[PDB]
Design a protein around this ligand. Structure first.
Ligand SMILES: *C(C[C@@H](O)[C@H](O)COP(=O)(O)O)C(=O)O
Ligand SMILES: *C(C[C@@H](O)[C@H](O)COP(=O)(O)O)C(=O)O
Ligand SMILES: *C(C[C@@H](O)[C@H](O)COP(=O)(O)O)C(=O)O
Lengths: 205, 205, 205
């Protein structure tokens, strides 16, 4: 199983250092306990260590769009606990695992999923899930080992979250539908509230 | 070409040893001549050699969800004639080919298909086909070598089988829509009859 | 950026040597400045060098369905300037780059795209785009380096071209909807006119 209370990952792509603390505090306040900042965000090497230090003991804090082994090294030193990727790159996964970090790497096919498992991944991100649909994951779950947690990422909304959870997703990574670069802290708190609400109702249902 | 009379693969995921002979006898009686038991089925190393021995000379008998080279070795000894996979793993394919077994490995992209061909695959499984659609295969067939048999697997029904065959599939692997773990032998005979009927009408049309 | 005026690739699959010059002249006359002949076209080693010689200084001329390193070598000698593929094969890409040819290789997942970039690809073909949709590319563009040109190929029409361009595609490769083996030169001029018109209106809009 995913080892954090609520299985939702807040993905804050394009957030800047001066806004990182407020937006992360918003998502955590609303119920999130996993947050990551993509490495294609401006000055991520300022924002990430800041959020680790403010929130590292309140939420699973980490990074996304992690494409090179050497980034894993840098992120470990920053106190990153979580590595999310758009792709399967075996040494990235192996290296992150080697630090005792939680890795949720991104695959899109059966072949790619089993490569990620062989690299030591304990969870999988299906990215982008929107093109494939809930049924894709349901089909993947019929071949994946039972204890592998699958996360839908890509076009997941508070409205459709239910269908991902029904299909067999342990949870979801939420990007643009939760945070787009330059939206208000109030919008972040609104969307994060919506997703937490949608998740809780989904389990109930 | 596929070298079995009717190009449909019966996939009996989660079948138990005590039910294997009856359900396989049902599908074969209805017209199937390829059957496989996924290795994520309980006690598959009891069911598979049993079905090889009862039916090996009446149908192409084998295994699915074959993920490790060492499983191919074990299955060869059991008298498996057919290896089906959800993914492309070159040594699995090479090893199975090396035994003179029929391999139908699972790919989802052009890149993965050409890797499987280079490993010696003579047929391809597109898995899961449902997310992609008939048109996906039609598009893949415009680049694949002409004599490669393509099998749709994933969300194929007796109702939509026609559209897969029209799109260029040589045949289909049928899983949950044919057999779900714990359904009656009578249900297996019903669904297998439906698929054989749908296939025959599809060629006619 | 793509370094040719209009970012549309004419793909003439199955064209024969005796028709190559007329059909290529049609597409170029209509506004195309990239054209390729797939290597699964009959007698491509006659058609390609012919079109390089007639049109090489009027358009980006090259080949598609390039699957083996040794084909790249042969095509270089023929004066091919452009290599298009259905799949990601690192040495094909590296070899073509090594000749100073423009490579637009085909990928379908994030993992495959980053492999192609690491092989030196400066542009990407998403193939087949039709199964995935415009939103797939939009999602891929959120992780790809900003300056990588993405081309939709597979089920692109003059009617839907707009939506690919809106989604973030720098352009498109047009196959069966532009040229099918055995259609008239007049049909090629008609479809090529339609695509150029659709593209120009798309930028305008
Ligand atoms: C994984 C990719 C993911 O973060 C993208 O932003 C797509 O998700 P949305 O469509 O924005 O929800 C990664 O960055 O590691
Ligand atoms: C291939 C995968 C296949 O067997 C799955 O069960 C999906 O098919 P259905 O959706 O059940 O029809 C393999 O096991 O090798
Ligand atoms: C890339 C594949 C492409 O050329 C195929 O023909 C699919 O495109 P259409 O559906 O025909 O538009 C390659 O050949 O390198």
């Amino acid at each position: 199983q995913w080892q954090t209370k609520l299985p939702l990952i807040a993905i804050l792509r394009g957030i800047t250092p001066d806004e990182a603390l407020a937006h992360v505090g918003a998502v955590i306040d609303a119920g999130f306990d996993a947050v990551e900042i993509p490495l294609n965000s401006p000055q991520w090497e300022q924002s990430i260590p800041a959020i680790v230090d403010a929130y590292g003991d309140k939420a699973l804090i980490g990074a996304g769009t992690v494409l090179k082994p050497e980034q894993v090294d840098a992120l470990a030193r920053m106190g990153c606990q979580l590595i999310v990727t758009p792709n399967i790159h075996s040494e990235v996964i192996r290296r992150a695992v080697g630090y005792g970090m939680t890795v949720c790497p991104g695959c899109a096919t059966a072949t790619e999923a089993f490569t990620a498992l062989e690299a030591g991944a304990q969870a999988l991100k299906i990215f982008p899930s929107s093109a494939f649909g809930p049924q894709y994951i349901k089909a993947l779950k019929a071949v994946l080992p039972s204890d592998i947690a699958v996360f839908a990422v890509g076009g997941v909304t508070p409205e459709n979250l239910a269908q991902w959870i029904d299909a067999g997703c342990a949870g979801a990574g939420l990007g643009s539908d939760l945070y787009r670069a330059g939206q208000s802290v109030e919008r972040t708190a609104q969307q994060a509230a919506a997703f937490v609400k949608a998740y809780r109702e989904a389990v109930q249902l």
